[PDB]
Enzyme design. Structure first.
Site, mmCIF file in Angstrom:
data_model
loop_
_atom_site.group_PDB
_atom_site.id
_atom_site.type_symbol
_atom_site.label_atom_id
_atom_site.label_comp_id
_atom_site.label_asym_id
_atom_site.label_seq_id
_atom_site.Cartn_x
_atom_site.Cartn_y
_atom_site.Cartn_z
ATOM 1 N N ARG A 54 0.801 -1.211 0.000
ATOM 2 C CA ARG A 54 0.000 0.000 0.000
ATOM 3 C C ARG A 54 0.843 1.275 0.000
ATOM 4 O O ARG A 54 1.445 1.637 1.015
ATOM 5 C CB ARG A 54 -0.953 -0.023 1.203
ATOM 6 C CG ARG A 54 -2.028 1.036 1.182
ATOM 7 C CD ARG A 54 -3.103 0.739 2.218
ATOM 8 N NE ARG A 54 -4.072 1.831 2.297
ATOM 9 C CZ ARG A 54 -4.194 2.640 3.339
ATOM 10 N NH1 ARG A 54 -3.419 2.475 4.407
ATOM 11 N NH2 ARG A 54 -5.034 3.664 3.285
ATOM 12 N N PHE A 59 0.809 10.654 1.070
ATOM 13 C CA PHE A 59 0.410 10.143 2.379
ATOM 14 C C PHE A 59 1.474 9.273 3.067
ATOM 15 O O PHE A 59 2.100 9.686 4.045
ATOM 16 C CB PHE A 59 -0.896 9.365 2.254
ATOM 17 C CG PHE A 59 -1.444 8.877 3.570
ATOM 18 C CD1 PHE A 59 -1.227 9.599 4.752
ATOM 19 C CD2 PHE A 59 -2.166 7.689 3.635
ATOM 20 C CE1 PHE A 59 -1.720 9.137 5.982
ATOM 21 C CE2 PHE A 59 -2.659 7.226 4.861
ATOM 22 C CZ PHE A 59 -2.433 7.954 6.034
ATOM 23 N N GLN A 62 3.148 1.792 2.962
ATOM 24 C CA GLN A 62 2.920 0.790 3.987
ATOM 25 C C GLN A 62 3.458 -0.566 3.592
ATOM 26 O O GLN A 62 3.392 -0.946 2.435
ATOM 27 C CB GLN A 62 1.414 0.705 4.302
ATOM 28 C CG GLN A 62 1.023 -0.314 5.386
ATOM 29 C CD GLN A 62 -0.481 -0.362 5.663
ATOM 30 O OE1 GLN A 62 -1.194 0.613 5.469
ATOM 31 N NE2 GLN A 62 -0.958 -1.509 6.119
ATOM 32 N N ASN A 101 -2.127 -0.353 12.182
ATOM 33 C CA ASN A 101 -2.991 -1.176 13.024
ATOM 34 C C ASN A 101 -4.451 -1.236 12.565
ATOM 35 O O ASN A 101 -4.853 -0.561 11.607
ATOM 36 C CB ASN A 101 -2.902 -0.729 14.495
ATOM 37 C CG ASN A 101 -3.393 0.692 14.714
ATOM 38 O OD1 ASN A 101 -4.377 1.116 14.125
ATOM 39 N ND2 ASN A 101 -2.714 1.427 15.579
ATOM 40 N N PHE A 112 4.289 1.886 8.443
ATOM 41 C CA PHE A 112 4.257 2.768 7.304
ATOM 42 C C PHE A 112 5.288 3.871 7.480
ATOM 43 O O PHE A 112 5.721 4.143 8.601
ATOM 44 C CB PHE A 112 2.839 3.318 7.025
ATOM 45 C CG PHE A 112 2.269 4.175 8.125
ATOM 46 C CD1 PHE A 112 1.753 3.600 9.284
ATOM 47 C CD2 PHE A 112 2.203 5.561 7.984
ATOM 48 C CE1 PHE A 112 1.192 4.393 10.263
ATOM 49 C CE2 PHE A 112 1.640 6.342 8.964
ATOM 50 C CZ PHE A 112 1.136 5.765 10.097
ATOM 51 N N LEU A 121 -3.280 11.147 12.428
ATOM 52 C CA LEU A 121 -3.008 9.802 12.899
ATOM 53 C C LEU A 121 -2.439 9.845 14.291
ATOM 54 O O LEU A 121 -2.224 8.813 14.901
ATOM 55 C CB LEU A 121 -2.044 9.110 11.951
ATOM 56 C CG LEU A 121 -2.624 9.137 10.546
ATOM 57 C CD1 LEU A 121 -1.537 8.797 9.528
ATOM 58 C CD2 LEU A 121 -3.797 8.161 10.491
ATOM 59 N N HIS A 125 -1.961 6.145 16.085
ATOM 60 C CA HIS A 125 -0.852 5.324 15.638
ATOM 61 C C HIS A 125 0.413 5.633 16.426
ATOM 62 O O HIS A 125 0.695 6.776 16.711
ATOM 63 C CB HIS A 125 -0.647 5.545 14.148
ATOM 64 C CG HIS A 125 -1.739 4.961 13.303
ATOM 65 N ND1 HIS A 125 -1.633 3.729 12.693
ATOM 66 C CD2 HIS A 125 -2.962 5.439 12.969
ATOM 67 C CE1 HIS A 125 -2.739 3.474 12.020
ATOM 68 N NE2 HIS A 125 -3.561 4.496 12.170
#
Lengths: 164, 6
Positions: A54, A59, A62, A101, A112, A121, A125
């Protein structure tokens, strides 16, 4: 003191470059330790060979799924998942290494690398490290991910390990 | 079902 690990990135097997990180063992020991023992392989399983399933431009990128490689597996050195040690460090910008997660206290092995400031986040996170050198590799690494995140080519962790 | 968003 703080542990330094790295990833040798490959675009379809063709090497691109290396990316080293600083794990903040001074803030998140257990969280950092996990990623360290995962980049070396000292438990028989890790990031070497796995990919970045990903990657969302602007952004983050991941990875960490060495079992299912589709965003379904991966595991820590303490078995499956593990708790949210704490929320002290923030997603202050590109380079930040934070835990991926599926809700609070579900930290496994997925993570990531942020390619921008992702403050939303924060609190959700656990940040535990930052790119020391090789963010420039994540620049081009990021051109291989669609809006939804699906890559154009296979971004792989050709090699990884601990230097200090 | 692991992943950051937004």
């Amino acid at each position: 003191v703080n542990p330094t690990v790295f990833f040798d990135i490959a675009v379809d097997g063709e090497p691109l470059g290396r990316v080293s990180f600083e794990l903040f063992a001074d803030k998140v020991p257990k969280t950092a330790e996990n990623f360290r023992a995962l980049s070396t392989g000292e438990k028989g399983f890790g990031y070497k060979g796995s990919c970045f399933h990903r990657i969302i431009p602007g952004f983050m990128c991941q990875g960490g799924d060495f079992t299912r490689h589709n965003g379904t597996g991966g595991k820590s050195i303490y078995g499956e998942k593990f708790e949210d040690e704490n929320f002290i460090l923030k997603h202050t910008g590109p380079g930040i290494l934070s835990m991926a997660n599926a809700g609070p206290n579900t930290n496994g092995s997925q993570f990531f690398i942020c390619t921008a400031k992702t403050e939303w986040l924060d609190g959700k996170h656990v940040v535990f490290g930052k790119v020391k050198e090789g963010m420039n590799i994540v620049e081009a690494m990021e051109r291989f991910g669609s809006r939804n995140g699906k890559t154009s080519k296979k971004i792989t962790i050709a090699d990884c390990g601990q230097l200090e | 079902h692991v992943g950051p968003i937004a």
